[PDB]
Scaffold this active site. Structure first.
Site, PDB file in Angstrom:
ATOM      1  N   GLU B 249       0.842  -1.178   0.000  1.00 50.28           N
ATOM      2  CA  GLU B 249       0.000   0.000   0.000  1.00 50.28           C
ATOM      3  C   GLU B 249       0.890   1.245   0.000  1.00 50.28           C
ATOM      4  O   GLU B 249       1.457   1.563  -1.046  1.00 50.28           O
ATOM      5  CB  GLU B 249      -1.061  -0.053   1.104  1.00 50.28           C
ATOM      6  CG  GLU B 249      -2.155  -1.100   0.730  1.00 50.28           C
ATOM      7  CD  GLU B 249      -3.322  -1.206   1.697  1.00 50.28           C
ATOM      8  OE1 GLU B 249      -3.339  -0.443   2.695  1.00 50.28           O
ATOM      9  OE2 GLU B 249      -4.233  -2.045   1.429  1.00 50.28           O
ATOM     10  N   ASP B 282       0.491   4.738  -2.330  1.00 45.37           N
ATOM     11  CA  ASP B 282       0.960   6.132  -2.232  1.00 45.37           C
ATOM     12  C   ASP B 282       2.319   6.260  -1.544  1.00 45.37           C
ATOM     13  O   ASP B 282       2.762   5.366  -0.803  1.00 45.37           O
ATOM     14  CB  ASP B 282      -0.088   6.999  -1.517  1.00 45.37           C
ATOM     15  CG  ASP B 282      -1.482   6.923  -2.165  1.00 45.37           C
ATOM     16  OD1 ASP B 282      -1.634   6.427  -3.310  1.00 45.37           O
ATOM     17  OD2 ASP B 282      -2.443   7.366  -1.504  1.00 45.37           O
ATOM     18  N   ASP B 285       0.894   9.241   2.747  1.00 44.89           N
ATOM     19  CA  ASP B 285      -0.553   9.401   2.882  1.00 44.89           C
ATOM     20  C   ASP B 285      -0.811  10.035   4.239  1.00 44.89           C
ATOM     21  O   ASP B 285      -0.905   9.339   5.249  1.00 44.89           O
ATOM     22  CB  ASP B 285      -1.217   8.028   2.772  1.00 44.89           C
ATOM     23  CG  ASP B 285      -2.728   8.071   2.974  1.00 44.89           C
ATOM     24  OD1 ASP B 285      -3.307   9.166   2.925  1.00 44.89           O
ATOM     25  OD2 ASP B 285      -3.322   6.987   3.179  1.00 44.89           O
TER      26      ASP B 285
END
Ligand SMILES: [Ca+2]
Lengths: 556, 556, 556
Positions: B249, B282, B285
Site C-alpha cells: 500500500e 501512495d 498518505d
C-alpha cells in the site's frame, strides 16, 4: 562447582586481546564479545578466521601496521565498533592549500609543502601529475610512488557493520561482501588507498552495501567508492548522510570502465543527503563509462551495441547533495534516463556540474560560483538531450574571460535564476511557459526593462525591448513607455514612444526615405515614410484586399 | 567463596536463551542483558513478562513463527537490537513489476507472477482488487485471504527502542506504547500487516513514537503507519530519515477515519527527511479524513460541526520528502491551516500530489513526470483555498490526452517552472509580482516572444504578444518588434510592427472599413480607418474634450 | 582456582553502582563497563576521576541533584549512554503559549501561567524582561533569579560521546573538550542553563565538537550552543540532524562578543539538516559580533582593524535548515564572505532572516509568513552588499501596516517568487537576466498584464504596462493589446491600443494641445498633436537630418 554453573549462566561472554598472543587466538576463543584492549601490531595480509561466529567486536586500542588486516568468516550480524587503524610508516605528504584555505595550483608551491606526517595532507599519486602540471619532474623521488595505508579488510562476509571507525593513514575495504555497512565513520584520516571501498569485482554483484553517516578526511584518492555494486530496484546500497573532506581525488566515486578483466561499474545505488568539501578532484563522480580514451567494450556489463558510451541505465537515486570547494568538478554523472534533484554546488575551481547524460531530468539544481579557475569550458555542461527544471546560476563572482556559464546545447531548460550574463547561456530551448501576470521591478535605474534576445541573431545584443523611463525626476508621477528594435547591430536603434516628456502622445518612427513595396508586411496596415523633396510624410498602404497604394499622410 | 564475591562485582550480567527452555524463563532470569543466541520458535500470542526490568536485549538469532510474539512490562530505557522475525508459512505472493522495473497493471499479468516465497513480492489483499481491476476473479483461491506475518509486538510499554530489526514476512507493532522508537530498521521484508505500526486506539493518545532512520521492503500494506498519535506542540513523534521500498500500500500512512469505535487519526507529527520509492499505492498518505464514502462523524475526535471534513488542524511538520515510482499518488494530505515544504515527487503513475487542504501553504514543491498512467484527472490537485509558492512541473514526459497538470481552482500560485502546457494549468490566481528587470532569451527560433494568455477568454490560445523577429539572417544586426492581438480566434491576427525589413518605421494597422463611433476608447486619441470609395485613410478622433470628429488622414 | 582463571578470560568486565557507596568508588573499580543501576544523588561540583580509562558507561537510572556532576579523566573513546539528569528543586516556570499554541506576548498573561514544575515551561531569566515588556515588575520575587539545572559536565576530555541523554531541568556541558559529541539526545527537558554547551574559553580552541541527531525541549536559554570553537578548514564540528523545541532563548547559538576576558566566537562549524521550532527568541543565531552596544575590541580574536564589526571570516557551512514558530527571528547571521543555502523559515513573529552580512551569498531561501507581530522593520533584512539567488516570499498572511518585506538596500537579488507586495521590496538591484521565452497566464481576470515599476519614481504605482484585455466575453476569440504610461501619478493614463472592440486597428494617443519642440525625442519620427482652432491633427516631425518641421496630419 555450583557457583561456576550459575556464573556461566549469568555473565556476558567476552574475550579480550590482552589475554592472547595473537589476534587469531582471541578470535578462536571468542563466543559473543571480543574486546581489543591493547594495541596490536599486525603484519600485512595477516588473516583472522572468526569461525562463522556472530561477534560483537569492541575496539579500545589500535591496530598498527602498513598493509591489510584481513577479517574473514564473520557471522551475519557481526559488528566492529571503534576500530582505529594506523600505519607504521610516516610518509611524505603534500598539502596543496594555504593557511587561508586557498588552493595551491603551482607545482613548485605544492612541492614546497612536503613534510613527513601521517595526516594534514596526502601522499602524491600519478593523478597529481595531471592535477599539478610539472609536479612529476619537481617532486623528489622519496615523495613519488609511496604506498602507505593501514587497511581493515572485511573479506567475503555478509551482514557485517563497521561502526565509528577512525585512524591515521587508514583505509576500510569490503572485498566481495554483501549487506555490509560503514556506519558513522569517526573522521579517519586517509592513506594511499580509498578510505571506504566496497569492491565486488569477483563473485556476485555487490548489494546491500552502504556508507551511512560519519565523515572522512584526507587520503590520496577517493573517500568513498564502489566497484561492481548493484542495489537492485530496491536501491539497496550507496551513500547516505556522509561527509567527505579533502579527498586527494573525489568525495564519492562510482568507478568507471574495466578494472582487471571485468566491469567496475555500479547500478541502482543511493547518493543522498551528503556533503563533499574541498576535494582535489571531484565532489560526486557518479559516471560509469570512461570519458577520455574509453574502452571499446564492457566485459561483464552491457555491450556498447545495447547501450552506447555514457548511456547506461544506471538508475541511481540522487538527491539532496551539497558540494563546496572542489579543485575539480563538483558533480559528475553519465547515463541515459537519469534523474537527479536538489543538488547544490558552490565555489569550485572546475565545472560545478559535468553531465554526460541523455534523456535525463535535473530538478532544482544550484551551481553557484564555479569554474572559478577556468579549468573547464563552462560552469555546467550537459552533452545529451536533457531537461533542467530549476537552475540557479551565479553567486558573487565575476567572469573575466569568454567561458560559457551553461553549455547544454541539446537540453531544454526552464527556471534560471541569478545574475547570469545571458551571452554565456547556450541551450537548445529556454522557456517560462507557465508564469502568471508579471511585474518587472527596477531598482537603481531611471528605467525598467523587459528585453528580448534572439540568440540566433546575436548572443550579446538584445534585439528589442519594452522600456519604461522616468520623465523629470523621482516623484514626478510621469514616465514614458518605449518599444524598440535593433538595427545595424545598435540596440534600441528604432523606437516608438508613448508619453515622452509627459506629452500624452505617441512618437512614431517613419522610414527615412522612400519605402520599398516589400517593407510593408500585413494587409490593412500603413507604413509612414519620408518624401524629402516635398517635406511630406507619405504612407505606403497595403489595402484590406492586399494591393498596395501610396498616399500623402502629412503636408506643409 | 571469596572469588564469587569479586566475580559478582566485576562482570557484566547477561543471560542467554540457549540456557533456557522458554523465552519467559530467560526473561525472568535476566537482570541487565539478555542474549538471543539460538533460534526460537514462538506460538502466536506467546507473551513474555519482563518484570519492569530495564533490559538490553541483543539478538543474534531468529524468532520464528506466524503471528505475534508479545513483549510486555519492559522498563523505560529497554533496548532490543538486531531482532529478526520470520514466518513459518511460505505464502503465495504477487510481484506486479517486470525485470525492467515497469509496473504491471493488467490483472492477468499480475496473476501470472504468483510464486511461493517469503519475499520479492507480497500477499494479495482486498485493496489489490481495486488496484488491479478484475484480479479478484482471476486469482486462485489459495492466493486470496492469506494472513501471514511474524510480528514483534511491544505492548503497553514506555521508553522502549527496537534497533536494527530485520526479518522475512516480518512486522513490528507498538500497541498502546509511548516514547518508543523503531530505529535504523535493517530492511525487514514485510508480511501481510504493516511493517512498522504505532497503534494507540486504547489508552492515552500515542506520543513520543518515532521511526528514525532505516528502511523496509515489500509488505502487503503500508511500511510505516500511525493510529491515534498526537505529538503535542513539541511535535514529539513521526518519521525522520526513513526509506520505504515497494509497500503493497503506502510508504508512510497516518490512518483516516474511525477504526473500531474511535478515531485512528493523528496530530502534530513530523514527516521529514524521508524517501518512499515504488509504492503500489501512495508515497506519503498524510490525510486524516476519509475521502470516498466518509463517516458522518468522528467518535473520539473533533466533531464535524467544529471542523468540516478534510479541515482538521492536523499541524504536522512536513519537510524534505522525496517520492519516486508510485503506482498510486506520490504525496497526499488533508487538513486546514497546513504547511508543507521542500517536497519532490518523480515518476508516479497517479497524481504527484493530491491535496484536500484549505487555507494551507505549500513552499518549493516539485512534481516531475507524474500521472503517467492517467489514473487521476491531474498531476497535482488542490481542493481548497491554498497558496503555492514555488512549483516545478514537467520533466521529460509528454501528455497525449487532455488531463490537467495542476487543478487548484481555489488556490493562488506563484513561481511555476518547467515546460508545462499552459492550457493544462487551472488555478484561482497566478502571478509573479516581484520580478526584477526581465530578459526573454530565445534559442532555436528566429524570434523571441513574451506572450499573454487570458484563460477566461481561452485556455489554448494566446490573446496577445510582444515579439522580436530576425530581419534577414543570423548576424544581420536587425530585428523587428511586433505587438499583436487575437481576433476571430486567430492568434496574432492584428499587429503593429517596428522596423520590419529594417525599414526603421512603424507599420500601423487600420480598421479595414468605416469605424463605428464606439471603436475608439480614450480621449485625445485617433483611430485610422479605410474609406474604400475614395482610396483614403480617415481618422476617427476622440478630441481632448471627449467629443468625436472624423478627419481625412491620408489621400491620393 | 582453575575456574577463576577461565572466568577472568571469558566474561565481560563491568562494575555497577549498586555495589558502591559513591560514584568515585565505582569509577575507580571500573575497567571496561560501568553500569548505573541505581539512582544517585550527587552534590553540586561532585567530581569523578576516571583514571584515563576508556569506559563504556551504561545508564539505567538517574543522576539526581541541582548543580554539576563533573566527569574528568575519561579516556579517548569513552561513551556514556542513556544518562538522565534531574534537579532536586522544582522551580517556578512560565509557559508563554496557549492551549491552541498561540504565543502569549502580554506580560500579565505570562505571569498568570506560573506553576511549579520541572518541565512544560521554563524559569524566567533577565532576557524575559526584554521579551515580555513589563514582566520584571509583575513577576513575583520567587519566580525571578532562579538557577536550577542538573548538569552533566564533561571536563577537559578528548573523544568522549554522550548518547541518548535525557532528563528534567537537565543540562549537558562539555568544558574545555575536543572531539566530543552529543549524539541522539533523547529529548531532555532543559533547565536554567543551555541544554547542550561546548564551551572552550580556556585552553585550545574547541574542535571536533558536535551535536549529532536527537532533540531537546524547553530550557530557559539556548538548546545547543558553542563558545570559542573552530572546526578548522575540515569543518570538524557543529550541529547536524538536530531538533530544538521551545528554547527559552534560541535553538542553535554561536556566541557573540567577549565572555570573561576572551572571545566566545566560533569559526568553521557546520549547521546542517536541522530544525528549530517555537523558540522564544531565535531559530539559528549564527552571528559572532554583538549587534546592540558592541564591544570596541575583540580580545583573543581578530582585531576590529583587521575585520570590522560583523565582517569576520566565520566560514560556517550552513545548509538545509528549517525554522517554524519563532517568537523572535528565524535565522540570524553576520560575517563577510559567507554562504548559506536551502534555508526555510515559516511563521515567525519577528524577522524570518536578519543578516548582518557583507559580500555574502544566499541561495534558495524561503521566508514564509514572518514578522507576523511586527517586532522588526521587515521579514528579511540584509545590511551589506550581498547576493540572493532564489527568494520565496509570502505564504497566506497579509500585512496590514507599512513594514517592508525585504530590506536589503545594498544587495542584488534574483528569483523572487510569491505574492509579495512589490512596494515592500527594497534592494539595490533586482533582475531576471536569464529567462527564456515568456508567457503571462492570467486567471480570474478579463485581462493579462506585464507591468513595469520604476522604484525611484514610485514604489507604489506601476509606471507602464503591456495589457491584453477581452473584447466581448469568454470564447469571443478577440482581445485588445494596450501599451500604457503613467502621467500625473495616474497609472495607465496614456495608452496606445491594438484591436479595441475587435476593430483591427491601432488607437494612437496624440498631444492634446500644441506640442513643444522638446516633446519629440528621435530623428525620423513624428508626434501627432491637436490644433483645436482648426479641428486638425498636426505632426511635429523630427526629420532624418534632425531638424524640426510642423506638418498637417489630418483635416476636416
Ligand atoms: Ca494627412
Amino acid at each position: 562447582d555450583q557457583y561456576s554453573i550459575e556464573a556461566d549462566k549469568k555473565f556476558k561472554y567476552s574475550v579480550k586481546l590482552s589475554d592472547y598472543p595473537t589476534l587469531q587466538d582471541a578470535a578462536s576463543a571468542a563466543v559473543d564479545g571480543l574486546l581489543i584492549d591493547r594495541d596490536y601490531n599486525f603484519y600485512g595480509g595477516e588473516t583472522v578466521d572468526f569461525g562463522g561466529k556472530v561477534l560483537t567486536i569492541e575496539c579500545k586500542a589500535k591496530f598498527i601496521g602498513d598493509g591489510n588486516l584481513i577479517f574473514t568468516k564473520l557471522g551475519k550480524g557481526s559488528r566492529i565498533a571503534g576500530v582505529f587503524m594506523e600505519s607504521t610508516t610516516t610518509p611524505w605528504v603534500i598539502k596543496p592549500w594555504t593557511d587561508d584555505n586557498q588552493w595551491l595550483t603551482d607545482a613548485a608551491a605544492v612541492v614546497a609543502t612536503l613534510k613527513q606526517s601521517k595526516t594534514d595532507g596526502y601522499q602524491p599519486t600519478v593523478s597529481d601529475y595531471v592535477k599539478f602540471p610539472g609536479i612529476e619532474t619537481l617532486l623528489p623521488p622519496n615523495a613519488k610512488g609511496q604506498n602507505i595505508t593501514s587497511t581493515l579488510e572485511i573479506r567475503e562476509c555478509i551482514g557485517v557493520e563497521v561502526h565509528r571507525a577512525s585512524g591515521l593513514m587508514a583505509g576500510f575495504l569490503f572485498r566481495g561482501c554483501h549487506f555490509c555497512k560503514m556506519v558513522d565513520a569517526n573522521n579517519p584520516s586517509g592513506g594511499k588507498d580509498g578510505i571506504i571501498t566496497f569492491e565486488n569485482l569477483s563473485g556476485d554483484w555487490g548489494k546491500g552495501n552502504y556508507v551511512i553517516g560519519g565523515r572522512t578526511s584526507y587520503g590520496s584518492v577517493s573517500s568513498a567508492q564502489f566497484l561492481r555494486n548493484n542495489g537492485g530496484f530496491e536501491r539497496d546500497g550507496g551513500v547516505i548522510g556522509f561527509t567527505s573532506y579533502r579527498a586527494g581525488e573525489s568525495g564519492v566515486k562510482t568507478w568507471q570502465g574495466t578494472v582487471g578483466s571485468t566491469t567496475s561499474r555500479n547500478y541502482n545505488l543511493q547518493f543522498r543527503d551528503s556533503v563533499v568539501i574541498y576535494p582535489v578532484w571531484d565532489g560526486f563522480d557518479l559516471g560509469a563509462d570512461t570519458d577520455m580514451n574509453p574502452e571499446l567494450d564492457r566485459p561483464g556489463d552491457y555491450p556498447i551495441t545495447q547501450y552506447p558510451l555514457h548511456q547506461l541505465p544506471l538508475n541511481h537515486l540522487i538527491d539532496n547533495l551539497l558540494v563546496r570547494g572542489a579543485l575539480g568538478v563538483g558533480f559528475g554523472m553519465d547515463g541515459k534516463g537519469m534523474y537527479a534533484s536538489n543538488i547544490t554546488v558552490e565555489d569550485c575551481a572546475g565545472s560545478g556540474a559535468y553531465l554526460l547524460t541523455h534523456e535525463s531530468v535535473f530538478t532544482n539544481i544550484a551551481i553557484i560560483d564555479t569554474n572559478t579557475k577556468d579549468f573547464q569550458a563552462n560552469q555546467i555542461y550537459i552533452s545529451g538531450a536533457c531537461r533542467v527544471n530549476g537552475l540557479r546560476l551565479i553567486g558573487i563572482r565575476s567572469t573575466d574571460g569568454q567561458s560559457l556559464t551553461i553549455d547544454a546545447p541539446n537540453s531544454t531548460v526552464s527556471g534560471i535564476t541569478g545574475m547570469v550574463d545571458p551571452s554565456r547561456i547556450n541551450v537548445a530551448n529556454l522557456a517560462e511557459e507557465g508564469l502568471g501576470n508579471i511585474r518587472a521591478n527596477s531598482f537603481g535605474y531611471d528605467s525598467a526593462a523587459i528585453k528580448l534576445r534572439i540568440h540566433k541573431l546575436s548572443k550579446t545584443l538584445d534585439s528589442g525591448a519594452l522600456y519604461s523611463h522616468i520623465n523629470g525626476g523621482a516623484g514626478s508621477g510621469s514616465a514614458y513607455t518605449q518599444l524598440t528594435a535593433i538595427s545595424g547591430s545598435t540596440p534600441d536603434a528604432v523606437s516608438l514612444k508613448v508619453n515622452h516628456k509627459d506629452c500624452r502622445g505617441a512618437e512614431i518612427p517613419f522610414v527615412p526615405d522612400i519605402a520599398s513595396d516589400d517593407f510593408i508586411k500585413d494587409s490593412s496596415c500603413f507604413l509612414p515614410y519620408w518624401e524629402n523633396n516635398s517635406t511630406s510624410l507619405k504612407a505606403l498602404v497595403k489595402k484590406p484586399n492586399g494591393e498596395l497604394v501610396r498616399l500623402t499622410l502629412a503636408t506643409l
